[PDB]
């Protein structure tokens, strides 16, 4: 067999440089790379694994049918160990088939409906493939999607709490679909954890992506942008001025039940908004964003109570449940009690007189805790400016920049 | 510090599983620990994560969810009844013994802050013990209590280095 001697010929080429030409023959396929090599594949990985083992798997998951025998469970076990001990920098030179391998694995787990074993797989691959923790790869979308199908939101938090500033070119490919998927599945993840402040931020980034045609993954982000903004803020926030023109001309007309919902959510009237929700209920349940409109119902009552603090200082419970349409002093008693615990209002309930007194005196700025709070905001801005200066300096030393 | 050392020990065990499903007692511990930390959203998602087949197999898991449903509605007088409707084995029992205290202290803080006057009937259902607090609270904690009308009246009870960092940044 000439293949066995050829393997040793690869060894003498490696470890003495010539890394560029090594990748040259990798992209030359190899006629399925002798897929029946599984018997000798165990001993093929000499030393502490090599890059060649990663190349072959990337091509035999795309057989378009029956990828890796009914024995997939056996192979996936070796794949799990492969990522955990591959090591080295050889993978970074080939950041086009590792991501492709991750896409094939993500597709496999989705069809078999087991989106929990791949969470521990697409968590160390990202950790070493990216240059730094602030670089967005094409595997972030897959990891967020996997933890979204099987609901384990906590593991994906460390990869959503960091501000992405770079996008991996991945040796070509990397279309806008992967970028939108990360900033849309991240929005769902934050929405589930009831973090609407950052969920709104993620949906906005997807909308502002430059585009020339309507996509299915961007259509259901303007819709959720409105609902999240209605829950967190009192109204629909204004989109950035540099948004793509496709959203203003094509995306908006399809999303007309949500726009009408915003129109009703401008004059406070829960009864009217209740009718619209039950009228367009078929649309809100088809898009699977049901249970995010029911929260808009609750938020209307809480917004109106938060407005009573702008005009009143002591209000009877019976009188309070007449402007907000709560229909009962007992119902209004628990609504206020819930809001105090959340921190959305400062008030105290006097059950003897059946009154609610709105304190509206949270804190004076004379605390050492507030001094530390301001300092924490200082360090975020100071360190953010440093990374802006660093990326600015690299522009100055660019050979293209100096010419003009 | 000692308690935190045990918290993170159970976290990773669910992630690595031979087939994506862990042993039943591991599932139950995570759900009960979520209740103790008041993290209701992840507790609800964990219940949705458990496959229906194992969910019906072990009714011990359902007992945790019935208690979790009450605390999800913030039904203070109702959680104390659901925590005793079922009997938990000694392997999970100490965790419930700490959730009950956490709920008890949570009601005490909420009443003292969100209420200026509360009926003794309602306050007892909140704190959980309508047994001996009726007479002990008058003289020890100092809260004046009036009978007949049953009204309780809660009462309220190194830098130089940082500064030179700011200037060294601003001037450069």
């Amino acid at each position: 067999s000439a293949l066995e001697q050829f393997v040793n010929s690869v060894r003498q080429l490696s470890a003495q440089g010539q890394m560029t030409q090594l990748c040259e023959l990798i992209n030359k396929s190899g006629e399925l790379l002798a897929k029946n090599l599984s018997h000798l594949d165990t001993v093929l990985g000499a030393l502490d694994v090599q890059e060649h083992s990663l190349g072959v798997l990337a091509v035999l998951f795309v057989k378009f049918s029956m990828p890796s025998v009914p024995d997939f469970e056996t192979l996936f076990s070796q794949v799990q160990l492969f990522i955990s001990t591959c090591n080295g920098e050889h993978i970074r030179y080939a950041t086009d088939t590792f991501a492709g391998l991750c896409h094939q694995l993500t597709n496999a787990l989705v069809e078999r409906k087991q989106p929990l074993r791949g969470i521990g797989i697409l968590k160390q691959a990202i950790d070493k493939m990216q240059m730094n923790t602030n670089q967005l790869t094409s595997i972030h979308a897959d990891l967020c999607q996997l933890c979204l199908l099987a609901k384990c939101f906590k593991p994906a938090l460390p990869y959503l709490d960091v501000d992405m500033m770079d996008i991996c070119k991945e040796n070509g490919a990397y279309d806008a679909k992967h970028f939108l998927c990360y900033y849309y599945y991240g929005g769902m993840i934050y929405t589930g954890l009831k973090n609407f402040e950052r969920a709104l931020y993620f949906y906005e980034q997807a909308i502002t992506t430059p585009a020339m045609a309507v996509s299915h993954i961007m259509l259901e982000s303007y819709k959720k942008y409105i609902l999240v903004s209605l829950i967190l803020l009192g109204k629909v926030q204004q989109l950035p001025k540099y948004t793509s023109q496709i959203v203003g001309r094509f995306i908006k007309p399809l999303s007309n039940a949500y726009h009408e919902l915003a129109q009703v959510y401008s004059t406070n009237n829960p009864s009217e908004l209740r009718n619209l929700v039950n009228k367009h209920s078929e649309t809100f349940t088809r898009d699977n964003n049901m249970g995010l409109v029911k929260q808009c119902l609750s938020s209307l009552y809480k917004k109106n109570i938060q407005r009573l603090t702008k005009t009143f200082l002591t209000l009877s419970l019976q009188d309070m449940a007449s402007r907000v349409q709560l229909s009962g002093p007992q119902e209004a008693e628990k609504y206020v009690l819930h809001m105090i615990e959340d921190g959305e209002i400062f008030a105290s309930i006097n059950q003897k007189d059946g009154m609610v007194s709105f304190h509206d005196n949270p804190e004076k700025y004379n605390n050492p805790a507030m001094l530390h709070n301001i300092d924490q905001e200082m360090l975020k801005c100071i360190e953010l400016d440093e990374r802006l200066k660093a990326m600015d300096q690299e522009i100055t030393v660019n050979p293209q920049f100096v010419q003009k | 510090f000692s308690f935190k050392k045990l918290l993170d020990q159970c976290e990773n065990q669910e992630l690595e599983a031979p087939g994506g499903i862990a042993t039943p007692p591991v599932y139950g511990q995570l759900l009960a620990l979520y209740l103790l930390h008041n993290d209701m959203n992840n507790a609800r998602y964990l219940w949705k994560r458990i496959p229906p087949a194992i969910k019906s197999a072990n009714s011990e898991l359902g007992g945790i969810w019935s208690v979790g449903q009450r605390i999800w509605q913030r039904d203070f007088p109702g959680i104390y009844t659901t925590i005793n409707a079922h009997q938990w084995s000694e392997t999970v029992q100490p965790i419930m013994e700490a959730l009950r205290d956490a709920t008890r202290r949570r009601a005490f803080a909420l009443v003292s802050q969100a209420y200026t006057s509360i009926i003794a009937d309602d306050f007892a259902a909140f704190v959980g013990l309508p047994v001996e607090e009726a007479v002990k609270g008058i003289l020890e904690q100092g809260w004046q209590a009036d009978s007949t009308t049953r009204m309780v009246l809660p009462r309220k009870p190194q830098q130089l280095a940082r500064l030179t960092d700011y200037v060294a940044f601003l001037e450069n």
Partner: peptide, 24 residues
């Protein structure tokens, strides 16, 4: 102050070197 000044002069030194090279 010395660190910031050194980095500022280091960038200015590098840009001038590549500028002089192609100036005949």
């Amino acid at each position: 102050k010395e660190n910031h000044n050194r980095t500022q002069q280091q960038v200015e030194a590098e840009v001038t070197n590549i500028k002089k090279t192609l100036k005949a």
